[PDB]
Amino acid sequence: MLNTTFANAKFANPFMNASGVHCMTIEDLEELKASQAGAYITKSSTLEKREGNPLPRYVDLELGSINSMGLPNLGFDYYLDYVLKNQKENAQEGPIFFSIAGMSAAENIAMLKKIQESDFSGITELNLSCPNVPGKPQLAYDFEATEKLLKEVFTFFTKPLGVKLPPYFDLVHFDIMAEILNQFPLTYVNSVNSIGNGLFIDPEAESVVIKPKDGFGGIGGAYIKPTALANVRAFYTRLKPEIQIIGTGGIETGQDAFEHLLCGATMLQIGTALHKEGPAIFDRIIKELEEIMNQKGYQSIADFHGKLKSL
Amino acid sequence: MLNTTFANAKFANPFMNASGVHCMTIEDLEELKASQAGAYITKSSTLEKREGNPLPRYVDLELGSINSMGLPNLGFDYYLDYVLKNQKENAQEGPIFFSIAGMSAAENIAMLKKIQESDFSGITELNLSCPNVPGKPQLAYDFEATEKLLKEVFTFFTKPLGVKLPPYFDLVHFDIMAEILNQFPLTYVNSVNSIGNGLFIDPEAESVVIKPKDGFGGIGGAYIKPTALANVRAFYTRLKPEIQIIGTGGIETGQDAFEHLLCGATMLQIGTALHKEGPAIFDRIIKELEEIMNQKGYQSIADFHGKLKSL
Numbered sequence: 335m336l337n338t339t340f341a342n343a344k345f346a347n348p349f350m351n352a353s354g355v356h357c358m359t360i361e362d363l364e365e366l367k368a369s370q371a372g373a374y375i376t377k378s379s380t381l382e383k384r385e386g387n388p389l390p391r392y393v394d395l396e397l398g399s400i401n402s403m404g405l406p407n408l409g410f411d412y413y414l415d416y417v418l419k420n421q422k423e424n425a426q427e428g429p430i431f432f433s434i435a436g437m438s439a440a441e442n443i444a445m446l447k448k449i450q451e452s453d454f455s456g457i458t459e460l461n462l463s464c465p466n467v468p469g470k471p472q473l474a475y476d477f478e479a480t481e482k483l484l485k486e487v488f489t490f491f492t493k494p495l496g497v498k499l500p501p502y503f504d505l506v507h508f509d510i511m512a513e514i515l516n517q518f519p520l521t522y523v524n525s526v527n528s529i530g531n532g533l534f535i536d537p538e539a540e541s542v543v544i545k546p547k548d549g550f551g552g553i554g555g556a557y558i559k560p561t562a563l564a565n566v567r568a569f570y571t572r573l574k575p576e577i578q579i580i581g582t583g584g585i586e587t588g589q590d591a592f593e594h595l596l597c598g599a600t601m602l603q604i605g606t607a608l609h610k611e612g613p614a615i616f617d618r619i620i621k622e623l624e625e626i627m628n629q630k631g632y633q634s635i636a637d638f639h640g641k642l643k644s645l
Numbered sequence: 646m647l648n649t650t651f652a653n654a655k656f657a658n659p660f661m662n663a664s665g666v667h668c669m670t671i672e673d674l675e676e677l678k679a680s681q682a683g684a685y686i687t688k689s690s691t692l693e694k695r696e697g698n699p700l701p702r703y704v705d706l707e708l709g710s711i712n713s714m715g716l717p718n719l720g721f722d723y724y725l726d727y728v729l730k731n732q733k734e735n736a737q738e739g740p741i742f743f744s745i746a747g748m749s750a751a752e753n754i755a756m757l758k759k760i761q762e763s764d765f766s767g768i769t770e771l772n773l774s775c776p777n778v779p780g781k782p783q784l785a786y787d788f789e790a791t792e793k794l795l796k797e798v799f800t801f802f803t804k805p806l807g808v809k810l811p812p813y814f815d816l817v818h819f820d821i822m823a824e825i826l827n828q829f830p831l832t833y834v835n836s837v838n839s840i841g842n843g844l845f846i847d848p849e850a851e852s853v854v855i856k857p858k859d860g861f862g863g864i865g866g867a868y869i870k871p872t873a874l875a876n877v878r879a880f881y882t883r884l885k886p887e888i889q890i891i892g893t894g895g896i897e898t899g900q901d902a903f904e905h906l907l908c909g910a911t912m913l914q915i916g917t918a919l920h921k922e923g924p925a926i927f928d929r930i931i932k933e934l935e936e937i938m939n940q941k942g943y944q945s946i947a948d949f950h951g952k953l954k955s956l
């Protein structure tokens with residue numbers, strides 16, 4: 335009953351891994367292909383292979399997680415060859431998602447041009463919100479820079495493209511962003527990336543828990559659900575219907591999934607919870623969501639999608 | 646052992662209520678004066694009395710709270726008369742804090758001029774981050790507007806002034822803000838106000854839980870501690886030492902208090918937890934902090950203040 339239509343493709347269910355979790359190597363990706371996930375996405379890549387930030391750079395917290403990975407990835411070519419090889423073997427229904435996070439506008443355009451030139455027929459996600467690279471601010475918090483990049487990208491990119499956005503906290507920002515985004519033939523927006531630059535402390539040791547950037551890292555998990563839902567909902571009511579939404583943030587039970595769909599998300603990505611539980615999470619959460627739908631007498635996501643009621 | 650020096654005043658301990666919680670009427674304020682709080686602050690006021698947003702506008706959540714009060718307050722004059730009367734009866738060691746949140750720059754300057762002209766000898770907090778008034782964005786997210794207001798305020802205001810700031814999530818924003826703030830004779834900065842425009846959902850009813858703004862409201866409590874600590878720490882390492890810091894956000898145990906002090910906060914404000922527990926919380930949290938200090942062999946806050954270690 336979780337059949338979903340997104341970017342003109344049909345998926346068995348709306349669940350995916352969030353970029354960066356369980357998708358670094360071909361082995362990780364194969365494990366995702368073998369799981370019950372409806373679709374999957376690669377780790378955000380750069381032109382060059384990156385080792386990332388020094389350890390420890392990820393810590394499981396009682397209410398979520400904190401990380402400052404620093405974009406460790408095997409390089410753009412590694413991921414491109416893998417998705418191209420995978421396209422030939424039609425052993426999967428639905429396109430694969432490819433995430434890119436260039437350190438500069440130039441690097442992003444270069445990767446997008448290569449994707450445009452290749453035979454890749456999947457979906458591309460442009461990450462405009464990595465908050466863990468020292469000296470690099472989040473592009474998506476600079477509205478003018480974001481619009482300029484997108485204008486240039488759409489002068490040549492014709493394949494499906496979505497953007498991974500950082501969370502916004504003021505309604506006017508949603509208004510400004512929606513207006514910038516609505517002028518482009520974007521396939522989707524994915525809200526949200528981790529809440530940037532939080533801090534977690536070990537009181538006994540009187541120190542931070544991660545090595546990079548003096549302990550400042552992205553926050554994910556239960557801590558961010560209220561912000562994640564707000565972002566999905568705020569964009570759902572402002573974006574032209576042609577642009578769909580992927581909801582990411584604080585999803586760990588079928589109920590969390592239900593809340594994102596009610597707000598208007600079409601596909602759902604699981605980060606922190608997947609990192610803690612492994613690919614078996616997809617099996618569990620699908621059962622939990624179906625159970626919720628059964629109790630309410632819903633037979634398809636279209637029955638309640640985007641139908642959040644106001645008081 | 647919690648004796649504190651802030652804005653050249655001595656306080657018995659660093660604890661205060663956060664503006665907006667338990668400080669709406671004279672009766673609330675008298676209860677704060679009677680508690681173990683080291684100091685207290687009034688509800689942010691406007692020139693005219695305001696009823697606020699429609700109910701329900703505040704909900705206790707398992708991990709914090711969500712609210713869209715809409716600045717309900719008894720008006721500037723009501724609070725001014727009360728603090729002035731209170732100044733005459735020296736039945737309290739340490740100044741009282743007065744919070745103002747004008748709906749426009751003009752309204753703020755008007756209130757500040759009245760405070761400047763009066764005999765008020767306490768501390769003023771300028772709220773530049775109310776996220777619950779429909780149609781009014783947060784002034785502190787507009788750097789240019791914030792600097793212009795402060796330039797004008799300091800051409801006449803000579804009494805102690807602090808600013809209540811919204812949380813920031815990109816290091817460059819801390820850099821830009823610290824540079825704007827460092828040019829003024831500010832007494833302090835208070836980080837942080839609630840995380841703006843989050844959303845909480847009742848899955849059974851399939852609706853939002855607060856009436857104003859379609860359910861979007863400020864988030865406080867456990868959800869926001871990582872962001873609160875990051876904001877206190879980021880400003881502590883960038884502001885000139887003359888400007889002290891009040892840490893607000895996610896404080897509910899002595900340990901939470903300890904973490905804020907370790908980051909560099911001097912005074913501490915309790916919002917959500919005080920709203921849930923009542924003024925008795927001060928008595929509890931003071932004992933908890935002292936216990937932590939005892940176990941570590943600390944006899945004063947100066948022993949570990951701002952001493953958070955990096956890895």
Ligand SMILES: Cc1cc2nc3c(=O)[nH]c(=O)nc-3n(C[C@H](O)[C@H](O)[C@H](O)COP(=O)(O)O)c2cc1C
Nearest residue numbers: 352353354378526527528554555583584604605606
């Ligand atoms: C270990 C880790 C690495 C991440 N790396 C990426 C990444 O490469 N690209 C990206 O767009 N987001 C990345 N994120 C952020 C997520 O994809 C997701 O937006 C976030 O964690 C919020 O969801 P969650 O609450 O389920 O964790 C990462 C998150 C974590 C926990």
Ligand SMILES: Cc1cc2nc3c(=O)[nH]c(=O)nc-3n(C[C@H](O)[C@H](O)[C@H](O)COP(=O)(O)O)c2cc1C
Nearest residue numbers: 663664665689837838839865866894895915916917
């Ligand atoms: C019911 C409520 C009303 C609030 N009203 C104000 C207010 O008038 N002025 C202000 O500066 N902050 C206001 N806040 C925000 C806080 O003072 C504090 O910054 C926030 O709640 C974060 O702290 P906490 O995690 O302890 O709640 C309010 C918070 C709540 C819960």
Ligand SMILES: O=C(O)c1cc(=O)[nH]c(=O)[nH]1
Nearest residue numbers: 403404405464466528552
């Ligand atoms: O690789 C990382 O550090 C990273 C990238 C990103 O976009 N988001 C995140 O939380 N981590």
Ligand SMILES: O=C(O)c1cc(=O)[nH]c(=O)[nH]1
Nearest residue numbers: 714715716775777839863
């Ligand atoms: O009165 C309110 O709604 C209010 C004001 C403010 O500054 N912060 C908050 O959380 N609530």
